[PDB]
Amino acid sequence: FNFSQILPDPSKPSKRSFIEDLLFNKVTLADAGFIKQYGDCLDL
Amino acid sequence: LTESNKKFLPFQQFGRDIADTTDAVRDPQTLEILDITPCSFGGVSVITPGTNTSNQVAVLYQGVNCTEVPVAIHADQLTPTWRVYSTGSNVFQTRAGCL
Amino acid sequence: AENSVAYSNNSIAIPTNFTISVTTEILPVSMTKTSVDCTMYICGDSTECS
Ligand SMILES: *[C@@H]1O[C@H](CO)[C@@H](O[C@@H]2O[C@H](CO)[C@@H](O)[C@H](O)[C@H]2NC(C)=O)[C@H](O)[C@H]1NC(C)=O
Numbered sequence: 001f002n003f004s005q006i007l008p009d010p011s012k013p014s015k016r017s018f019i020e021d022l023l024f025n026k027v028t029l030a031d032a033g034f035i036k037q038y039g040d041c042l043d044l
Numbered sequence: 045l046t047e048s049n050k051k052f053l054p055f056q057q058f059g060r061d062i063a064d065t066t067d068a069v070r071d072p073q074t075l076e077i078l079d080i081t082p083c084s085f086g087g088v089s090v091i092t093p094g095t096n097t098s099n100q101v102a103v104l105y106q107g108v109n110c111t112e113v114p115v116a117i118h119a120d121q122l123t124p125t126w127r128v129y130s131t132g133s134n135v136f137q138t139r140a141g142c143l
Numbered sequence: 144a145e146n147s148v149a150y151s152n153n154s155i156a157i158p159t160n161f162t163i164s165v166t167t168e169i170l171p172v173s174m175t176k177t178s179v180d181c182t183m184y185i186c187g188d189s190t191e192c193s
C-alpha cells in the first residue's frame with residue numbers, strides 16, 4: 001500500500017504532503033493578516 | 045501624506061477609495077498629486093499570569109511591526125499606562141505583532 | 144436508470160468480486176477569526192465621533 005502522496009514530504013520546506021500541497025494550491029486564500037500586511041499598506 | 049505615482053487628469057482633483065473616502069489629493073500650492081494613508085493603529089492584548097501568583101505583565105501589540113512600537117509613545121491617549129512597555133526593553137516580533 | 148429487481152423465492156445473487164473505492168469527503172473545520180475595532184470602523188479618526 002503506497003503512502004508517499006499523503007505522508008509528509010521532507011523535500012517540501014513547509015512539510016505538507018503532495019496531496020496536501022495540491023489542496024493548498026487549489027484553495028485560493030488571501031495573505032490577509034498572517035503577514036500583517038502593515039508595512040506594505042503603510043489591495044483589498 | 046506621501047508622493048503618489050497615480051497621475052490625475054487635468055480636470056481631476058481627488059482620488060477616492062472603495063468606501064467613498066478620499067485617498068489621493070492634488071496639492072493647491074504646487075500641482076503635484078499626493079496619496080493619503082491613515083496613521084498606524086492596532087490591537088493590544090495583555091498577557092498575565094494569575095493575580096494570586098504574581099503581578100508581572102507582558103503586552104502584545106497586534107498587527108504592527110517592531111520598527112515603530114518601541115518608539116510609538118508619540119504622546120498617545122493611553123501612553124502613561126504602557127509607558128514602560130512603550131519604551132521596549134524586551135522586544136519580540138511575532139506574526140501576531142510586536143510582543 | 145430504470146431497474147426492476149428479479150425477485151424469486153428460490154433465487155439469490157451473490158457477488159464474486161469487489162472494488163476498493165477511495166471516496167473523497169470534504170469537511171470544514173474552522174473559519175477566519177476576524178476581529179473588529181468598532182471605534183475605528185465607525186469613526187474614521189474622529190474624536191467627536193468617539
Ligand atoms: C508510490 O508512488 C510514488 C508516486 O505516487 C512513486 O514515486 C515515484 O513516482 C514517479 C511517478 O510520478 C515515478 O516516475 C518514480 O519512478 C517513482 N519513484 C521511484 C523511486 O520509483 C513510488 O515509486 C511508489 N512506491 C512504490 C513502492 O512503487
Ligand SMILES: *[C@@H]1O[C@H](CO)[C@@H](O[C@@H]2O[C@H](CO)[C@@H](O)[C@H](O)[C@H]2NC(C)=O)[C@H](O)[C@H]1NC(C)=O
Binds near residue numbers: 036037038039040110
Ligand atoms: C518589519 O520590519 C523589518 C525591518 O524594517 C522588515 O525587514 C526588512 O524587509 C525589507 C523588505 O521587506 C528588506 O529589504 C530589509 O533588509 C529588511 N530588514 C531587516 C533588518 O531584515 C520587515 O519586512 C517588516 N515586515 C513587515 C511585515 O512589514
Ligand SMILES: *[C@@H]1O[C@H](CO)[C@@H](O[C@@H]2O[C@H](CO)[C@@H](O)[C@H](O)[C@H]2NC(C)=O)[C@H](O)[C@H]1NC(C)=O
Binds near residue numbers: 159160161
Ligand atoms: C476481480 O476484478 C479484478 C480487476 O482487476 C480482476 O483482477 C485481474 O488482475 C490482474 C492483475 O492483478 C490483471 O492483470 C487482470 O487483467 C485482472 N482481470 C481482469 C478480468 O481484468 C480479478 O481477476 C477479478 N476476480 C474475479 C473472481 O472476477
Ligand SMILES: *[C@@H]1O[C@H](CO)[C@@H](O)[C@H](O)[C@H]1NC(C)=O
Binds near residue numbers: 072074
Ligand atoms: C501659488 O500658486 C500657483 C498656482 O496656483 C503656483 O504656481 C505657485 O508656485 C504658488 N506660489 C507662489 C509663491 O506663487
